[PDB]
Amino acid sequence: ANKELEEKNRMLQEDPVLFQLYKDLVVSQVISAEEFWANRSDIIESIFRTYPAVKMKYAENVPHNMTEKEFWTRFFQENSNAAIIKRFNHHSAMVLAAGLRKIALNLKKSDRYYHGPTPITSQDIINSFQSIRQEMEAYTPKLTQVLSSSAASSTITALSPGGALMQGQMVPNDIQSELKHLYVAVGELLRHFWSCFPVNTPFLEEKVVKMKSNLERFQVTKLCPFQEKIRRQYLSTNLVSHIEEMLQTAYNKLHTWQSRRLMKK
């Protein structure tokens, strides 16, 4: 069955971003689209599941020279007294059948938390203690001692934007959407490329897919710089270099892990 074709038809226009990115991976003819998907009323229904007799009657009386309104009409249509009780018993039983398908912790080192990840003679204490004890025999010098005009003016100049302690562009708009779309594409493909990269996966069938994805990295990064070139030759302003870091770091991880694999071998 063409289940893949049916799913592609379903998502062709319902979701714009998914199909946009999937098509983009083919617009420049980067790779085959197989890997894309390889890696990644109520009343009538209730009666249908409730009454098997109604199911059989529907199968035998499928619309043929008749009308669904007439079929609806056929639905509602001491001997009768006991029939009602029997009908409730059977109907509740049918509904129920349809719903019934066939360590105390101990530690040895706690001061490590007291000094967490945050990083970092005797007569001196005596001298400082006595000196500070004798320091404050006089109090309330506020009248002049606390502040002076020259120091205050220096402080205000420092607080000025050009002073110390106080150091002090949305021009492009349409480029924003293009950058967002490119970032989404990079994320989409990096997701699969990094899906199993951190895990060692020392198996043949597991490593085959990482090798294929690593080649796909080369093949996608082949086309990325061409769009980069198109965008660059406009004004030579507001450089977009963050995208380069992702590609270069992915390449560095790829090559370093390749060297590590060779060393392990």
Partner 1 sequence: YMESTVASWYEQGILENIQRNKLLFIETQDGAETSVALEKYQEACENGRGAILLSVARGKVSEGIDFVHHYGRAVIMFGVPYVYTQSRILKARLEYLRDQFQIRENDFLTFDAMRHAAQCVGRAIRGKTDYGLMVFADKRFARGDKRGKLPRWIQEHLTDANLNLTVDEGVQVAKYFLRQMAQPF
Partner 2 sequence: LNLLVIVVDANPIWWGKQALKESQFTLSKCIDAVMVLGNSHLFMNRSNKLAVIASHIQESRFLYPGSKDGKYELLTSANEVIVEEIKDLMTKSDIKGQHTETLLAGSLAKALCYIHRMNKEVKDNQEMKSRILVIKAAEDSALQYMNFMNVIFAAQKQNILIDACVLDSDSGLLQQACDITGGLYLKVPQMPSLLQYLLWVFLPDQDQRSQLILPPPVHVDYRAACFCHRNLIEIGYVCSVCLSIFCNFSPICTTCETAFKIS
Partner 3 sequence: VRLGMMRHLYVVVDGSRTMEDQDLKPNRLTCTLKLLEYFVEEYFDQNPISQIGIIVTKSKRAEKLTELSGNPRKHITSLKKAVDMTCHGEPSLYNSLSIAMQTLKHMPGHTSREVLIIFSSLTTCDPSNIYDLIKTLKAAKIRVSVIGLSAEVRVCTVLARETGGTYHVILDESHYKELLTHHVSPPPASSSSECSLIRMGFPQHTIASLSDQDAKPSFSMAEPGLTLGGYFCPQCRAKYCELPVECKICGLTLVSAPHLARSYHHLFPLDAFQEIPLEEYNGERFCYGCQGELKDQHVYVCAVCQNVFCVDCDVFVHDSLHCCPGCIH
Query: Which residues are at the interface with partner 1 (CB under 8 A)?
Result: 81-82, 84-86, 88-89, 92-93, 95-96, 99-100
Q: What is the DSSP letter of 234?
A: T
Q: Are 234 and 257 in contact (CB under 8 A)?
A: no
Q: Is 180 in the site for partner 3 (CB under 8 A)?
A: yes
Contact of residue 23 among partner 2, partner 1, partner 3, none (CB under 5-8 Å per partner type): none
Residue 99 or residue 141: which is nearer to partner 1 going by CB?
A: 99
Cα distances (Å, whole numbers) of residue 159 to 113, 137, 150: 39, 34, 14
Residue 99 or residue 117: which is nearer to partner 2 going by CB?
A: 117
CA–CA dist 176, 262 (Å, integer): 42
Q: Is 167 in the site for partner 2 (CB under 8 A)?
A: yes
Helices and strands per DSSP (H, E), number in the chain:
13, 0
Q: Is 246 in the site for partner 3 (CB under 8 A)?
A: yes
Q: What is the dihedral of CA 207, 211, 214, 218, to 10 degrees?
A: 180
CA angle 11, 197, 182 (to 5 degrees): 45
Which residues contribute to the site for partner 3 (CB under 8 A)? 99-101, 103-105, 113, 116-118, 170, 176, 179-180, 183, 187, 190-191, 194-195, 198, 238-242, 245-246, 249, 253
Which residues contribute to the site for partner 2 (CB under 8 A)? 105-120, 122, 124-136, 138-142, 145-148, 151-152, 154-156, 158-159, 164-167
